[PDB]
C-alpha cells in the first residue's frame, strides 16, 4: 500500500550508514616503519641546493631502498618551507610510518652525520656514496634535469635557489593528478600543465627534469601511500584560506585544483549529466533505484569531510561504494548524454562489464532526438513556441 | 469486514517477532575448546617473517590438528598489528572457543616454548617438527608462494616485512567473500580481486601464494566458524570510522566492501528489482502476502543490528527466514525482471523447487513488453507522450 | 493452484465441500486479474 515503497526508502538509506558509527579501538594498530628524512637545518642556499641535488639522485638511484626514497621525497616536498622539520611534523597523519627528522647541518658531497664520528656513522656514509655512485652510473651520464648545465650549477643567491626549488617542486606536483588513476596514460596532461606554468612565467624552464626522472618519481609516488598522504595533507591545509599565500603555496593550490575529484569521473559525470540537465527520459522504472542510490551517495560524500575529493589518492574503502557498478543503469545513461554533449567526454575509458548499450543508446537519443527540453520558465515566453522549433531546427 | 485484512496484518507482524524478546540464561552454555595461538612477542621483522612462514606451513600441513590450524589462522590474521595478542583478546566474541595467547619470544626453526625446558616441552617441540616435516613433504616440493624464492627469503627490513605480510593478509581475506556461499565456484572473483589490488599496487605480487595453498585455506575457513567469527568482528570494527586507517585496515575494509551482504542475493535482488522499480504488475492480489512478508523482513533486518550483512558468514538462524521460499512468487518475479534488466544477474543459480515459471514469465514480460512506465514527475512534461513512445520504440 | 509444493498435503477430510474447492480453483485463474488498491496511479493499466 502507501507504507511500502517508503519503508524501503528509509531501509536503503539506513543500509548505507549501517555500521559507520562509534569509535574504533587502538587494538587495530598498524606496524610502523622508521623513515629517515633529511631536512636542511639552515637557510643557506648553497646547502639547500646541494641537498635537493642529493634528494634527486636518491630518487633516481636504482639501488636505493624504498624507505630512503620516501625520505628523499619528503625532503624534496618540504624544501620550500623555511622550517622543513616543523612542516613535516605538523602536517603528518600517516599511521603506517613514523618520521625521524634529521637536521642535515653542514653539507659534504653526501651528508655529514656529525654525531660521534666512527661510532655507527661510517657505514651510513659509505651507503650514501653507494647511493650516489649507482644513481649517476645507472643513467647514461644523463642528469635529472633536461639541461646538463642545470646539474653542476653553483647556487649562492637566495633568489635563484627559490626559483630553482619551485620548478623542482612544481614538476613533482604535476604527477599527483594522474599518478594512481592512469599513470601509464600520463605525460600528455602533465606536459600541458607544465606548458601552462611556463607561459605564466611562474616556473623557470631552465630547471626542467627529464622525462626519464619523472617516470621514476611517478612510479615511486604510485607505489607509496605515505607520500600521497603527506601531499594530500598539504593540499587540504593550503586549500584553507585566511593567511597570505607565497609563490610556492599558490602553485601548489593551483595544481590542487586539477587534483581534486580525481579518479571519480564515473560518479561525477552521472551527477552532472545523468542527474542534472533534467531529461523527460529519467523516470522510466529503471532509474528510480539508481536515483535513490545516487541521493544516498550525496549524503555520504557530505558526511566524509574535507578528505572526500581526494578519496582515490588516499585509497579510502568508501570509494568502492561510489564507483559505477552499484548503479550501472543510470551511469550508462549518464555517459550516453555525456559523450554527445561534451567533446572532451569520449576520451574516457568506459569499457566496463556493465555497459548496458540499450540504456547507452537511449542517452545518445536523449541529447538530440528526445526533445528541445524547455524547463520551467520564470520569464513568461508565451510566443516562444517557434523559438523551440528554431532551436530544435539545428 | 473492514477489521479483517488489518487484524491479519497485525497478526503477521506480531508472529514475525513472536518470541524474540527477553534475555536467555547461562544454562545453555556451549562446551569450550582450548585454542593455542602463537603471536609474536617483539617487533623484529625476522621473527615475524619466520612466524608467518611457520603459520603458512602449519596451515598447509595435512597432519595438523584442526585446533592447530585455527591457531595458525589466528596468528596469520593478527600479524599486521603491532600487538597481536591485544588485538585477538579485544576482538574475540566466540563462545565456542577459548583462546590461550602464547607470546613466541625467540625463534628456532620452529618455536621455542622457553618454559621449563624438558618439562612438558620436548613433546611439543617434536610435534611441531613433525608438523613442519609433513607440511614440506606433502606437496611436491612446492612452497606456499607461487615463487620458490619467496619462501626461503631472508627478511630484515621492516618495510619488506610489512609488504609481504600485507600481501599474505590480502590474499587470505579474498577468500572470505565466497568461502561459504559457493567455495567451489570461486577462483574467478578471487583472481579478479587479486588483479585489481595488484593494479592498484597495494600488494606486491612477489608474495603470491599458490592456488593449492589457497584451496586448502579456503577449505579450512569454510569448515571452521571461529575464524569466520573473528574475521567478521575485525570487519565490523574496521568499518566503524573515526580513527586513522593503516594500509592493512584500508585493504581489509575494501575487501569487506565486497564481503557485505554475501549469501543473501535472493532477498536483496527481490527488494531492488521486484519491490523497487515500481511496475504496474506489482499489485495483482497474488503479491500482497509476499509484500507484507518482505516488509516484516525489512523491519527484522533493521532490528538485527550491525551483524545483519554478515548473517551467512556467522550462520545466524535468522537467515533461514530471509531466504526465498517464504515468498517464492515475488522472488520469481524479481528474478525475472533482474535477468531481463541486469546482464550480470543471470549467472546466479536459481534452480530452486519454487521457481513458478508463470511468474518468471510475467516478470520477463513486465521488464520489456509491459509499458514505458513513467512514474510521478516532479517536472511537468506536458508533451512527453511522444517522448514515451520513442523510449518504448527502443 | 498457486503453490506448486502445496498439493502434497493430505486433505482428504470429511468436510471437503468440492463446490467451494472448485470455486477456489476458478478464483486463482478464471476469476479475474485482481488489481488491488493502487497507491501509484496507473491510468493506462487497463491493457496492462
Q: What cell was used for B127?
A: 610435534
Nearest alpha carbon to residue B300 among B278, B323, B328: B323
Closest B-chain CA to A26: B87
Strand partners, A103: A39
Q: What is A94-151 written as a DSSP string?
A: -TTEEEEEEE--S--SS----SSTTSS-HHHHHHHHHHHHHHHHHTTS--SBSSGGGT
Residue of A nearest to C38 (CA): A1
How far apart CA B286 and CA B271 sit, in angstroms, is 17
Which residues of chain C does B356 touch, with a Cβ-Cβ cutoff of 8 Å? 4
Gap between the Cα atoms of B38 and B54, Å rounded: 10
DSSP class of residue A327 equals S
Q: Are B324 and B331 in contact (CB under 8 A)?
A: yes
> Reduced to 3 states, what is the DSSP secondary structure of residue B97?
strand
CA distance linking residue B77 with residue B244, whole number of Å: 20
State the Cα–Cα distance between residues B128 and B111, nearest whole angstrom.
Answer: 8
- The CA distance from A171 to A212, in Å, is 13
Is B283 within 8 Å of C5 when comparing Cβ atoms?
no
Query: Residue with C-alpha cell 639547500?
Result: A48
Residues whose CB falls within 8 Å of the CB of residue A159, separated by 6 or more in sequence, listed in order: none
How many residue pairs bridge chain B and chain C with CB atoms within 8 Å of each other? Answer: 34
Mode of pairing for the β-strands spanning A97-103 and B97-103:
unpaired
User: CA-to-CA distance for B243 and A110, rounded, in angstroms?
Assistant: 39
Whether A59 and chain B come into contact, CB under 8 Å, resolves to no
Scan residues 4-23 of A and list those with Cβ closer than 8 Å to C: 5
Q: Residues with Cβ < 8 Å from B371, sequence gap 6 or more? A: B280, B392, C44, C48
Distance CA A201, CA A247 (A): 12
Residue of A80, A56, A109 whose CA lies nearest to A220 = A56
CA A317, CA B255: separation in Å to the nearest integer? 8
C-alpha distances out from residue B236 to A301, B66, B92, Å? 21, 26, 12
CB A37 within 8 A of CB A103: no
User: If you write DSSP's letter for every residue of A202-228 in order, what string do you get?
Assistant: SS-TTS-B-HHHHHHHHHHHHH-HHHH
Q: In 10 A of CB A149, how many CB atoms?
A: 9
- Beta strand A33-39 with B97-103 is unpaired
- Compute the distance between CA of residue B276 and CA of residue A4 in angstroms, rounded to an integer: 10
The CA angle C31-C37-C42, to the nearest 5 degrees, is 95
Residue C45: enclosing H or E segment and its boundaries? none
Q: Tell me the HSE value of B300 on the side-chain side, using a 13 A CA sphere.
A: 24
A8 vs B318: CA distance, rounded Å: 20
- Environment class of residue B363 by beta-carbon count within 10 Å: exposed (0-12), middle (13-18) or buried (19+)? buried
Report the gap between the CA of C2 and the closest CA in chain B (Å): 9
Contact predicate A207/A168, CB 8 Å: yes
DSSP 8-state class, residue B90: T
Which of B193, B216, B180 lies closest to B316, judged by CA?
B180
Residue position matching grid coordinates 617516470: A215
Cα B266 to chain centroid distance, Å, stands at 16
Q: What is the DSSP letter of A243?
A: S
d(C-alpha B128, C-alpha B122), whole Å? 10
Q: Does B158 touch chain A (CB under 8 A)?
A: yes
Question: Which residues of C are less than 8 Å from A1 in CB distance?
Answer: 37, 39
Residue B200 is placed in which grid cell? 592498484
d(CA A77, CA A234): 10
H helical segments located in chain B:
7-16, 45-60, 66-77, 84-89, 122-138, 158-174, 189-199, 211-223, 226-239, 247-259, 265-269, 288-304, 311-314, 319-322, 328-341, 357-368, 385-393
* Gap between the Cα atoms of A298 and A321, Å rounded: 12
DSSP, residue by residue, A325-385: TSSHHHHHHHHHHHHHH-SSTTSS----TT--HHHHHHHHHHHHTS-------SS--TT-H
Q: What are phi and psi of A145, to 5 degrees?
A: -80, 150
In angstroms, rounded to a whole number, what is the distance separating the alpha carbons of residues A47 and B299?
A: 68
* DSSP conformation class of B101: E
Resolution reached, in Å? 3.5
Contact B56, B214 (CB under 8 A): no
Distance CA B25, CA B263 (A): 31
Amino acid at each position: 500500500m502507501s507504507d511500502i515503497f517508503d519503508e524501503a526508502a528509509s531501509f536503503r538509506s539506513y543500509q548505507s550508514k549501517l555500521g559507520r558509527d562509534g569509535r574504533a579501538s587502538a587494538a587495530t594498530a598498524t606496524l610502523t616503519t622508521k623513515i629517515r628524512i633529511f631536512v636542511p637545518a639552515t637557510n643557506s642556499p648553497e646547502l639547500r641546493w646541494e641537498l635537493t641535488l642529493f634528494a634527486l639522485d636518491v630518487i633516481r638511484s636504482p639501488s636505493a631502498a624504498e624507505s630512503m626514497k620516501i625520505g628523499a621525497a619528503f625532503t624534496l616536498i618540504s624544501m620550500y618551507s623555511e622550517r622543513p622539520g616543523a612542516l613535516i611534523r605538523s602536517l603528518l597523519n600517516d599511521p603506517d610510518i613514523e618520521a625521524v627528522i634529521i637536521d642535515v647541518g653542514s653539507m659534504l658531497n653526501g651528508i655529514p652525520v656529525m654525531e660521534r664520528r666512527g661510532d655507527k656513522a661510517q657505514e651510513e656514509m659509505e651507503g650514501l656514496m653507494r647511493i650516489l655512485k649507482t644513481a649517476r652510473e645507472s643513467s647514461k651520464g644523463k642528469t635529472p634535469f633536461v639541461d646538463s648545465r642545470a646539474y653542476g650549477l653553483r647556487i649562492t643567491d637566495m633568489s635563484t635557489l627559490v626559483s630553482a626549488v619551485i620548478t623542482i617542486e612544481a614538476q613533482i606536483w604535476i604527477l599527483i593528478a594522474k599518478a594512481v588513476t592512469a599513470p601509464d596514460t600520463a605525460e600528455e596532461s602533465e606536459t600541458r600543465r607544465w606548458a601552462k606554468y611556463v607561459q605564466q612565467k611562474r616556473v623557470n624552464p631552465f630547471f626542467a627534469l627529464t622525462q626519464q626522472w619523472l617516470t621514476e618519481m611517478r612510479n615511486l609516488l604510485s607505489q607509496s601511500l605515505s607520500v600521497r598522504k603527506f601531499m594530500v595533507e598539504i593540499l587540504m591545509e593550503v586549500k584553507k584560506g585566511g593567511s597570505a599565500k607565497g609563490r610556492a603555496v599558490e602553485i601548489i593550490s593551483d595544481i590542487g585544483n586539477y587534483v581534486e575529484e580525481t579518479g571519480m569521473a564515473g560518479f561525477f559525470a552521472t551527477i552532472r549529466f545523468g542527474l542534472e540537465t533534467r531529461y523527460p527520459a529519467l523516470a522510466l522504472n529503471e532509474f528510480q533505484s539508481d536515483l535513490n542510490t545516487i541521493k544516498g551517495l550525496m549524503l555520504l560524500y557530505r558526511e566524509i569531510g574535507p578528505r572526500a575529493p581526494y578519496m582515490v589518492l588516499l585509497e579510502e574503502s568508501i570509494q568502492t561504494k561510489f564507483a559505477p557498478g552499484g548503479y550501472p543503469l543510470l551511469w550508462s545513461f549518464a555517459m550516453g548524454v555525456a559523450t554527445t554533449i561534451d567533446r572532451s567526454m569520449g576520451a574516457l575509458n568506459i569499457n566496463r562489464g556493465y555497459l548496458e548499450p540499450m540504456y547507452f543508446r537511449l542517452g545518445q537519443k536523449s541529447a538530440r532526438h528526445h526533445a528541445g527540453g524547455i524547463d520551467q520558465n520564470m520569464a513568461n515566453k508565451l510566443g516562444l513556441n517557434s523559438d523551440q522549433v528554431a532551436e530544435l531546427a539545428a
